Write a protein that binds this ligand. Structure first.
Ligand SMILES: CC(C)S(=O)(=O)N[C@H]1Cc2ccc(Cn3cc(CO)c(C(F)(F)F)n3)cc2C1
Ligand SMILES: N[C@@H](CCC(=O)O)C(=O)O
Ligand SMILES: N[C@@H](CCC(=O)O)C(=O)O
Lengths: 261, 261
């Protein structure tokens, strides 16, 4: 029995720095959905743990030249972290080199606009040029478009990969900031979960439009062959069944809404 | 390399007998979402297979006295089938004795009424007595209510377990038949997937009402420690990503709709 190093990422409402964080030390610097979930998984698996923010601030992609994984995936892979507890999407390129528990939350790629933007769908975006759009770097959303064989999404990806200036953003906060400050002339593609939280946060100037483009989920990830893999997974199933996963969704989404009803 | 025995269950639109089935032999007797999915999993894993309907017609529960599993779970457990490819819900009591791939489709428990029934929610059902309601025997929906510690669902379960005549049904077709032929005086609790298919099938006299009561999914199941476990799971992830899972949902739900738009 050894203290587990948890890799995670600063992403609202999953993991956020408390406002008085310079007061505080350790796990107490952080609050969020995945902070709460880590404390539940650690209880049901019987371990002690250290929350730690991914040094490079990325989710995880592999450089096509070096074949080096960055982000939280690379933290696991190179043995710097023992478990990743974060909105980290379950994908094939990833499930190869790490293990994922069953999905604790569902999401699909969605479109965020400034209120008033004449865009209702992904089709609407691919058929025009006035409103720019993009995704996050180093993540599952970017790769969905890169590797897509569907007509509209390949059209979107060819626009996106060569557009000037860049339509790609380093953090979600950056994509959101660009929607808000671009006067309706940028739309952001992000996961439905993140979009729905932000949609209900002041200044209440963004909106989610269109149906989800895919159906995926987030998993707890452990390095390939870890002894934490099976206990962690039974713990997700059990918290599902206890209603604890729904209760934490309500806490950090619905109860945090500032944009009316 | 040996021919895989697939256990599955007659449930619309997942697996149905073709109308000329007495013409036909083998896998060709059957059509459906899970028929199509079995053919994809078998291709991507490189195996040959036999579709076979569970002899007892159940999903899988364990007798509390004998501790014997019935249904498709018990077919796997006692080594009669090699893989279960069906709308079989991923649960903790089950993930113990069998392995489940990641979820290929999502569902929640939902409420089906005859059109015109004054019921909008699960709360509405628990607070009245004129309209009877129940679930399927030997399945995850029945166990959700039995083991629930939430107020409304425990209230529902206490009513349901001792109501006369029985509110429990052996097959989904039976629950649906009871809604249709009970003049609004029975409501059925079933998975949202099954409800949404039936809702769009003639005589177009049922309706799904209220939000889902839980968030679960169906998995492909193999006996604990099978060599098919990891290939099958990579195949679900890959078909997800190829869009094949969405394409098969559309085929057997949206394209099969007879109740207008
Ligand atoms: C293999 C890929 C398709 S995936 O990304 O891993 N799965 C997708 C599709 C889907 C379906 C349902 C659910 C919901 N769900 C929650 C739980 C609780 O562990 C579960 C449980 F695992 F228990 F079924 N499901 C999520 C997702 C995302
Ligand atoms: N959850 C995604 C990041 C968000 C996005 O790509 O939109 C990932 O794990 O890569
Ligand atoms: N899919 C469920 C059966 C349907 C239901 O219980 O409503 C199971 O695997 O047990």
């Amino acid at each position: 029995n050894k203290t587990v190093v948890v890799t995670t990422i600063l992403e609202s409402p999953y993991v956020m720095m408390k406002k008085n964080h310079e007061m505080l030390e350790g796990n107490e610097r952080y609050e969020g959905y995945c902070v709460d979930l880590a404390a539940e998984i650690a209880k049901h698996c019987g371990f002690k743990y250290k929350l730690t923010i991914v040094g490079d601030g990325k989710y995880g992609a592999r450089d096509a030249d070096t074949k080096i994984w960055n982000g939280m995936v690379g933290e696991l892979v190179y043995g710097k972290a023992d478990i990743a507890i974060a909105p980290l999407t379950i994908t094939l390129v990833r499930e190869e080199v790490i293990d994922f528990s069953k999905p604790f939350m569902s999401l699909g790629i969605s479109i965020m606009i400034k209120k008033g933007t004449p865009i209702e769908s992904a089709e609407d975006l691919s058929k025009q040029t006035e409103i720019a759009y993009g995704t996050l770097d180093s993540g599952s959303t970017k790769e969905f478009f890169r590797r897509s064989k569907i007509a509209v999404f390949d059209k979107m990806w060819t626009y996106m990969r060569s557009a000037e200036p860049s339509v790609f953003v380093r953090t979600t906060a950056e994509g959101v900031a660009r929607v808000r400050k671009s006067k309706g002339k940028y739309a952001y593609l992000l996961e439905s979960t993140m979009n729905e939280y932000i949609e209900q946060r002041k200044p209440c100037d963004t909106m989610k439009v269109g149906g989800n483009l895919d159906s995926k989920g987030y998993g707890i990830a452990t390095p390939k062959g870890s002894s934490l893999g099976t206990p962690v997974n039974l713990a997700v199933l059990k918290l599902s069944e206890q209603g604890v996963l729904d209760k934490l969704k309500n806490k950090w989404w619905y109860d945090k809404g500032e944009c009316g009803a």
